[PDB]
């Protein structure tokens, strides 16, 4: 029974785990290891936070509590999927109803006015947003892309847009009064509580938060964007985009940071179509329309209104369109625009790829256009800055030379930023914002404005300290340079490089290229000994941590999904995630059409290959090492003989890899000696599997090209998405009879 939790999640990965789970399944059953699943999706996770609602037949284990708990026990070895940070709009919204349509009965949202409305909507919000990687990520992130993946990647170049040295493209950042401009930190120094509380002009106070809990050597920052600022920084930025002839594009993480971003997001879908909805602020009001929620929400709340008072708005809405520079879009077609859903463009993989596409996103014809990124905060902005300031002076990587930045990043404990959520507050009225300890001594203070957004971020010293560890080993097991990502610009920062700098001196330095710099200057220093061909690890902070794990790997192999990401659990446990990628909604949108699934699960691939080690390791299964030494090497037959999904109609899909790597495995097995048995108990299968692969494939790729039906999207029939999913009944026979 050996434990290896293999999660289910939400929309391509989710789909894939049909056609690779039960591979997976085969392979790992006849040597007394244990696969079992969680539900930790969007529409799970929902139905299991209001059992009241539901019937006996409908309700179903909370699992992410329960895995919550399993990451701090040592036995753990979790396999995890990418999954979907519901935003508030259709994402959170539209899956709700999902059920509730033909299914369950839960119950609704927004601007609570009862006492019923606000219980329940204090439920949902802990439901949307970021809810599953913090729990689960009780270590520090370790991504890397392995040799044999840059070695495909280096013969098999994934497309590069051309670049142009006279491109217009830019990202564009406030250059005062904001979160990075706003920063003040603080050392905890005995295990206690902080109280955040507002001290209004009028002399009264308001509590934010009495309670939060504060370890001894904690790190603990705050920092507030301003609304006047942010507000008088948009219209700038747009004014000037239209002169510049280029795209308007927003590049905000409104989907982990659930409570900030969607109210930076608002701000601009509001100085944007504020004529319209100046001209109409009460229809809208009357409706309830939640800018936060982007103006698609408007186009949906509408519907409602006279025949006639929408084409009116509507009407209008066009009116902004022509007098304000054109959004990128999300999809060009159907008219989705950049400013439509709070998470259609999340900065982490929107830029990469924009850099890619020869720093262009589509704009409302249909083509490419130079864009005008707009990164308001200044914390990593400039790191984007520097990449795009590095390609139109000296052309597109090449896949085939450039070097790998890998990233040792902290994360730990909800560490840094991915955290703050309960702690950022939109200011109640002008005043100051003082956080205050047990004894009553002043940690905090940082003047606050009405409409205003404060935060407090604390980084925990065990975790800094595991980090930097991991760091060093990395440093070491390659042997090239390092750098840590902290700018001393940054109250905070400059906390964690004393930490830094005191802990190195616990670990042998000898022969490491080991150094400290900004985010700005590590750039530049790593996009030098990139382009040259040299390696270069990158030691960063949480946030960094994604953005990059999501950008350099991008630039070399196509796909962050395409890499590996090791979670060393600090209590011997092992968080295996799939890639530095997320879940692919148009991968769905193809899938759903033409039936044809392009995601690459080579992700999976490694992570099983990394938790069936893991398992071995920590245990007395020898089994375990050889089928995961086997499926390390399937593996490579897949990136040798160009097994891996196509992107059109036609040739290779998912399964058909999965098949390959079914195919590969059995092989590999069957075929090696370290463990007779095996060999023995999957001949059966290896030689079935190559007689009927031209067969096989041919009953896969038969079923590419018509459009497929699941019920639905967040909650699948999951009947119809198997079939769907496991066409070659041929295959499917070859398997049950091991
Ligand atoms: N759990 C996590 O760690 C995690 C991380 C990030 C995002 N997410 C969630 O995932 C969703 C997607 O966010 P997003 O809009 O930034 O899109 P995304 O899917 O993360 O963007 C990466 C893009 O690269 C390609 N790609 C990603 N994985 C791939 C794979 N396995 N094989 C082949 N191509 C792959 C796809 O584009 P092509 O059309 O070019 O193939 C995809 O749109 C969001 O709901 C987000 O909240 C979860």
């Not at 839960?106 to 009862?114: A, G, L, R, S, V």
């Not at 670990?507 to 590590?522: F, H, K, Q």
Request: glycine share 6%.
């Amino acid at each position: 029974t050996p434990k290896i939790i293999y999660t289910l999640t939400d929309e391509a990965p989710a789909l894939a785990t049909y056609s690779l789970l039960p591979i997976i399944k085969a392979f790992t059953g006849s040597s007394g290891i244990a696969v079992e699943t969680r539900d930790i999706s969007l529409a799970g996770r929902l139905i299991a936070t209001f059992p009241e609602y539901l019937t006996d037949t409908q309700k179903i284990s909370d699992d992410l509590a329960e895995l919550g708990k399993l990451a701090t026990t040592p036995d753990a070895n979790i396999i995890k999927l990418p999954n979907i940070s519901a935003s508030v709009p259709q994402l959170k919204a539209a899956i709700k109803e999902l059920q509730q349509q033909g299914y369950k009965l839960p119950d609704y949202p927004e601007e609570p006015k009862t006492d019923t409305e606000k219980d329940v909507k204090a439920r949902y919000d802990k439901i949307k947003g970021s809810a599953v990687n913090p729990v689960l990520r009780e270590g520090n992130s370790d991504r890397r892309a392995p040799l044999s993946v840059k070695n495909y990647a280096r013969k098999h170049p994934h497309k590069m847009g051309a670049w142009s040295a006279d491109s217009k493209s830019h990202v564009a950042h406030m250059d005062n009064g904001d979160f990075y401009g706003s920063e003040k930190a603080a050392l905890i120094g005995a295990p206690g509580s902080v109280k955040i509380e507002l001290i209004a002009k009028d002399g009264s106070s308001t509590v934010l938060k009495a309670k939060t809990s504060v370890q001894a050597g904690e790190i603990i920052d705050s920092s507030v964007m301003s609304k006047n600022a942010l507000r008088n920084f948009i219209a700038a930025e747009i004014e000037d985009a239209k002169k510049q002839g280029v795209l308007l594009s927003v590049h905000l993480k409104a989907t982990m940071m659930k409570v900030s971003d969607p109210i930076m997001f608002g701000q601009i879908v509001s100085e944007f179509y504020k004529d319209a909805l100046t001209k109409h602020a009460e229809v809208l009001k009357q409706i309830g329309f939640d800018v936060n929620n982007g103006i698609g929400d408007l186009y949906a709340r509408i519907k409602t209104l006279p025949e006639a008072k929408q084409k009116e708005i509507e009407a209008d809405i066009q009116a902004v369109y022509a007098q304000r520079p054109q959004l990128a879009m999300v999809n060009s077609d159907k008219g989705i625009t950049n400013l439509h859903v709070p998470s259609d463009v999340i900065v982490d993989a929107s830029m990469p790829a924009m850099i890619r596409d020869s720093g262009k996103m589509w704009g409302p014809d249909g083509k490419l256009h130079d864009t005008k990124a707009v990164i308001p905060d200044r914390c990593y902005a400039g790191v984007y800055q520097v990449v795009i300031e590095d390609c139109k002076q000296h052309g597109a990587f090449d896949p085939t030379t450039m070097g790998s930045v890998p990233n040792v990043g902290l994360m730990a404990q909800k560490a840094e930023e991915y955290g703050s959520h309960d702690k950022t507050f939109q200011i109640p009225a002008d005043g100051v914002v003082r956080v205050t300890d047990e004894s009553g001594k002043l940690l905090l203070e940082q003047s606050v404005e009405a409409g205003d957004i404060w935060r407090m971020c604390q980084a925990k010293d065990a975790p800094i300290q595991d980090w930097v560890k991991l760091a060093v080993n990395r440093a070491r097991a390659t042997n090239t340079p390092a750098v840590f990502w902290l700018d001393p610009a940054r109250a905070h920062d400059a906390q964690v490089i004393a930490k830094v700098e005191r802990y190195l001196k616990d670990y042998d330095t000898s022969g490491l290229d080991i150094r400290i710099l900004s985010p700005v200057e590590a750039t530049r220093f790593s996009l030098a000994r990139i382009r040259e061909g040299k390696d270069t690890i990158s030691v960063t902070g949480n946030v960094l941590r994604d953005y990059l794990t999501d950008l350099f790997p991008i630039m070399e192999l196509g796909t962050s999904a395409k890499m590996l990401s090791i979670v060393p659990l600090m209590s011997g446990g092992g968080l295996f995630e799939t890639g530095a990628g997320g879940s692919a909604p148009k991968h769905v949108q193809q899938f759903l059409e033409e039936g044809y699934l392009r995601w690459d699960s080579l992700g999976e691939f490694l992570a099983l290959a990394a938790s069936l080690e893991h398992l071995g390791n920590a245990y007395k299964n020898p089994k375990a090492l050889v089928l995961a030494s086997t499926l390390d090497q399937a593996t490579g037959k897949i990136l040798d003989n160009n097994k891996s999904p196509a992107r059109k109609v036609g040739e290779i899909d998912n399964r058909g890899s999965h098949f390959y790597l079914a195919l590969y495995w059995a092989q590999a097995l069957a075929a090696q000696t370290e463990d007779k048995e095996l060999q023995a108990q999957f001949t059966g299968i290896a030689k079935a599997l190559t007689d009927n692969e031209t067969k096989i494939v041919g009953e896969l790729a038969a079923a590419q090209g018509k459009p497929v039906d699941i019920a639905g999207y967040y909650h699948p029939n999951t009947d119809l998405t198997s079939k769907a999913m496991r066409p070659s009944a041929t295959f499917n026979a070859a398997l049950a009879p091991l």
